[PDB]
């Protein structure tokens, strides 16, 4: 169910970062600790926004009609 | 459903004034002003400035309840000083300091790169 636009507790836009997040983990083969850090996500409030994020949309599309 | 719409924190309702003025009965030469649709952002800044002035005897603000935006500022001045003037002086001081800040900052910003 989608990334948060903007992390609840800080305010910072986090929506635009998901696409890049999965690239930095799978293609570049980096650990999640640096994948949060490369995306400029320095404080933990805005780090838990993305690491803890479960992306169910992908499974929701699986349904045909 | 019993939630009061958020605009009621800065928008003034029906026949509400931004300031109400009231003489205090308990202490001589004291006044209690009720600021509508304001809060700590403003109360604290004025009560701080109403303290640097050596002609004021008493200075305090409180938000009676957080549910409503209002706050009460009580001021007490020395004989021959009107409290309404202490607030006037106090306010101007604030604007002055701020006008400086703004100018000093713009001066510093323009001396940066990136």
């Amino acid at each position: 169910m989608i990334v948060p636009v903007r992390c609840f507790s800080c305010g910072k836009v986090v929506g635009d970062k998901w696409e890049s997040y999965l690239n930095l983990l799978q293609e570049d083969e980096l650990d999640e600790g640096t994948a949060l850090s490369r995306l400029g996500l320095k404080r933990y409030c805005c780090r838990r926004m993305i690491l803890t994020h479960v992306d169910l949309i992908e499974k929701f599309l699986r349904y045909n009609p | 459903m019993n939630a009061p719409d958020r605009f009621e924190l800065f928008l003034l309702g029906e026949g509400e004034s931004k300031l109400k003025i009231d003489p205090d009965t308990k202490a001589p030469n004291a006044v209690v002003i009720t600021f509508e649709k304001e809060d700590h952002t403003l109360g604290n800044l004025i009560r701080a400035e109403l303290l640097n002035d050596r002609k004021v005897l008493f200075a305090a603000y409180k938000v009676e309840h957080p549910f409503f935006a209002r706050f009460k500022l009580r001021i007490q001045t020395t004989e021959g000083y009107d409290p309404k003037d202490a607030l006037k002086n106090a306010c101007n001081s604030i604007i002055n300091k701020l006008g400086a800040l703004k100018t000093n900052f713009e001066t510093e910003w323009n001396l940066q790169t990136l």
Binding site: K12 | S17, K18, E49, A100
Partner: protein, 263 residues
């Protein structure tokens, strides 16, 4: 100049980090609060859904649109809708925008803030554009469509103070610290054996001098010098977020003064 004193340390397009000398804690604080939640911006405040066949629900998306950051450089020349003499909204008080997205491919069609298009007349002012800091050139995931999924929306942005909704906050997070060494003794440090070995020394210790065990407590000293860092979402550049901060405080201090005149 005369009173307050600023000194930028590091400055970029998204962060400003500075020292703020010769001011009262009250003011330094009020500068924080008024930055956080009182500078006006622009953000979607009414969506009219025409067709929505996605997995995400109507009000869900609407909410996601609220959050999308909008360019608010010339936001001071745009009026509040509550003030404007029109009916509902115009070009003088709102920006209206349309989104259309349909499932084209097999590969999941994505919907970005890039795909939002301005449909009202701007009249030459730098407003309403959707802010993108993405390297890929499209920012913020709106929704995902499948084979034959259609979304068709009409968003009317309006002017708003963050106090009305957290969407109109231009501020993100705002660092704030004074007196790195406990020299004013404003905090009682919690410890087990040793205070200073257990608590960590902050970036801002290299700009003040240690207290020296030999010296007695200074009681006459007050709060001065304030280390801050103000971040920005991108609807207003950093420089202005603090400027407008100072300005809006200044405005609502004055309106107190001008309502003593009218009384």
């Amino acid at each position: 100049e005369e009173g307050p004193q600023v000194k930028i340390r590091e400055a970029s397009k998204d962060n400003v980090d500075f020292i703020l000398s010769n001011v009262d804690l009250a003011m330094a604080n009020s500068l924080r609060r008024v930055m956080i939640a009182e500078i006006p911006t622009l953000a979607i405040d009414s969506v009219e859904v025409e067709t929505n066949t996605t997995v995400l629900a109507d009000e869900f998306i609407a909410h996601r649109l609220g959050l999308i950051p909008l360019q608010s450089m010339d936001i001071e020349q745009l009026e509040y809708s509550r003030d404007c003499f029109c009916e509902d909204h115009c070009d003088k008080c709102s920006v209206v925008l349309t989104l259309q997205a349909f499932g084209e491919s097999e590969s999941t069609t994505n919907v970005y803030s890039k795909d939002l298009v301005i449909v009202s007349n701007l009249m030459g002012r730098n407003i309403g554009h959707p802010i993108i800091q993405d390297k890929e050139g499209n920012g913020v995931l709106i929704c995902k469509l499948r084979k034959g999924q259609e979304l068709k929306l009409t968003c009317v942005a309006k002017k708003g103070i963050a106090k009305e909704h957290a969407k109109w906050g231009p501020a993100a997070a705002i660092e704030f610290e004074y007196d790195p060494w406990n020299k004013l003794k404003h905090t009682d440090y919690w410890y087990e054996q040793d205070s200073a070995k257990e608590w960590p020394q902050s970036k801002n210790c290299e700009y003040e001098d240690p207290p020296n065990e030999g010296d007695p407590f200074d009681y006459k000293a007050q709060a001065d010098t304030f280390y801050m860092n103000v971040e920005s979402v991108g609807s207003i550049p950093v420089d202005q977020v603090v400027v407008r901060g100072i300005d809006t405080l200044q405005k609502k201090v004055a309106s107190i003064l001008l309502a003593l005149t009218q009384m």
